[PDB]
Design a protein around this ligand. Structure first.
Ligand SMILES: Cc1ncc(COP(=O)(O)O)c(CNC[C@@H](C)OP(=O)(O)O)c1O
Ligand SMILES: Cc1ncc(COP(=O)(O)O)c(CNC[C@@H](C)OP(=O)(O)O)c1O
Lengths: 356, 356
């Protein structure tokens, strides 16, 4: 049960989803780039033909964007498909995931028949990934999934720690899958694509749906420099999985040279202002997320924050279904100032004026 | 290597794909319904949110269309996804497919770890499915895939034979998967959805991409009346696989009450006129396909028809890669009269004036 389920949320209340303000999914509040919408409208008739099965133009655009060989890239029907593709293409016998984390890594691995080991983040560490994981990495592991920054904490592990993990993985023959779905939101963070050349054991997952606001179109991709392994992924993949409009949108989106700075500026300004306001609320712990969402811990047990905000027609993410987190945890997106203010006001009604 | 690969075909020639006339994919020549295009343009901003994970409106529309419980239906990112979903959801140990047939059944089963048995259609039978298959059906089979009408022959097995197969399957505990991807083109053919109520061993695959001309959007679905099995399919399925525009397009498409009659009329008129003209060509055998495509057998060995037509900038499907068919076999779509005439003229240049 993932976030962004507004139709389901509205159904629970008996109202139309157009009446809900959603903070349970984390999509760039700027909306899709104007050029993207124009291109979609202008080329809509392209849907009367099958997509290019090899997605030449799309992969060329992604390759030019990251300055890597097009052969290192495989686009997917959302990064969600890329996660299932890597799991099925690598068919690990034993794999480690880090909890709490995005639920699909586990679903994908389970379906592929893998023995899943969980590395548990600790509330006492403020949910930060630590070097304690290194000693937990063993030769018998085939894969390790890390999310950078993590869903739902928004925390980004230190580059040196990620490098230490990557190096250990290289020596223990472990494939390292880095989920960089939200990395574009963190100013100046390059991720690991610039370092794949001499590290064929590293796989990077990317998504265009949150940063460019096209989650309804579905577009993500996987990058890796092992010629043979990527070739195998191209087969284990279902044909025409990426729709023609997603491919077009992706190409156009990457051409908007102002999008990145505009998004970073918003995060640095409103995002910082929103975070400060949340931290001024009583009976609430707010974690220092680096992208467009924040993990919250409600210090009032006798209060289902999600149920309470839903009656106020504001949908938030309940993190109780993440392994490792309990009913006190929730996640909210960072949106436009006006919407953020409505969220804040709702939270105050449930948090201010209450004794410990 | 499926048909519709115009970008790849154009690349082989060193030209732009906009210069090719494609007869290698079989899409309704009328294009997408006008209401569908209007709805897509009017609701394009819906892509700024994730699709409804449960696709309520879409499944409700499909259920109303077939007058069956919405619980019997699962939409997919093209019927291609539905094929992979049924294979993975049923995880057959032994399964039978009929050759020649669409390549994805075999790919899907192979990936799921199934022992595949092939029932071979015979050139001496004019590639018709016969009752000889019944004795080949055994208790140890878990699944049987039939395509009605078949890709690439366009032949539709007799209802009584399909019923006999279905009944035998029911008694031998075999799941029967009927690929009805092209059934909408055959006037008055209802398929098996109207008969699923008391046959939970029957699974029907449907596609909206050829009949409504949205192969670039990707939309198909699976129907079955076994409560538990469909429930399992809803899990083995990847979340948000159907994009928001495909779901919208599907709902709108089903509301066009003139589309069906218009398409049937075209097939009965131009389709019949095209078929007759093909049959007047020398050194060519044309099979009696019932939908919008026809299988051709070139009686001139020393002539690669596809290569020869490609130089004339017309792309056709070579069926040499179908198990059971050799280099003499090709398939062509049935399109508009003008385009059909260009195809005919090209064929004449390669077939007329030549001695046996
Ligand atoms: C870390 C992470 N990785 C990959 C994806 C897949 O993205 P896409 O397929 O659109 O490219 C998501 C989406 N997450 C969407 C969100 C609604 O799910 P939760 O409430 O469980 O966080 C994600 O959060
Ligand atoms: C029998 C059959 N079933 C299912 C599909 C999948 O349809 P979709 O995913 O668009 O709903 C196709 C598509 N076939 C497309 C065609 C180009 O492939 P070939 O040249 O191998 O025949 C098909 O021919």
């Amino acid at each position: 049960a993932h976030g962004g389920n507004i139709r389901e949320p509205a159904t629970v209340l008996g109202i139309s989803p157009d009446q809900l303000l959603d903070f349970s999914a984390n999509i760039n509040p700027l909306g899709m780039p104007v050029s993207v919408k124009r291109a979609l409208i202008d080329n809509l008739d392209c849907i009367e033909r099958y997509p290019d099965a090899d997605y030449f133009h799309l992969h060329q655009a992604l390759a030019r964007h990251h300055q890597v060989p097009a052969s290192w890239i495989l686009a997917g029907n959302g990064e969600t498909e890329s996660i299932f593709t890597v799991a099925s293409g690598l068919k690990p016998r034993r794999a480690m995931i880090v909890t709490p984390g995005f639920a699909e890594y586990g679903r994908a691995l389970a379906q592929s028949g893998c023995e899943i080991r969980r590395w548990s983040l600790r509330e006492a560490d403020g949910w930060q990934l630590t070097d304690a994981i290194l000693e937990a990495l063993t030769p018998d592991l085939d894969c390790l999934f890390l999310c950078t920054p993590n869903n739902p904490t928004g925390l980004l592990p230190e580059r040196p720690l990620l490098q230490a993990i990557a190096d250990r993985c290289k020596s223990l023959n472990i494939n390292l899958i880095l989920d960089e779905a939200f990395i574009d939101f963190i100013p100046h963070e390059t991720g690991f694509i610039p370092a794949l050349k001499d590290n064929p054991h590293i796989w990077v997952l990317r998504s265009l749906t949150k940063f460019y606001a096209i989650p309804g179109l579905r577009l993500g991709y996987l990058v890796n420099s092992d010629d043979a392994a990527m070739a195998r992924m191209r087969r284990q993949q279902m044909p025409w999985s990426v729709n023609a409009l997603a491919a077009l949108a992706g190409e156009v989106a990457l051409q908007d040279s102002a999008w990145q700075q505009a998004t970073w500026h918003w995060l640095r300004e409103e995002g910082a202002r929103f975070y400060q306001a949340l931290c001024q609320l009583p009976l609430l712990t707010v974690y220092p997320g680096r992208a467009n969402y924040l993990l919250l811990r409600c210090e009032r047990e006798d209060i289902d924050l999600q149920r309470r905000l839903l009656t106020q027609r504001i949908l938030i993410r309940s993190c109780a279904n993440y392994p490792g987190l309990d009913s006190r945890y929730y996640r909210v997106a960072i949106r436009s100032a006006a919407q953020n203010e409505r969220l804040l006001a709702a939270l105050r009604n449930v948090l201010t004026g209450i004794a410990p």
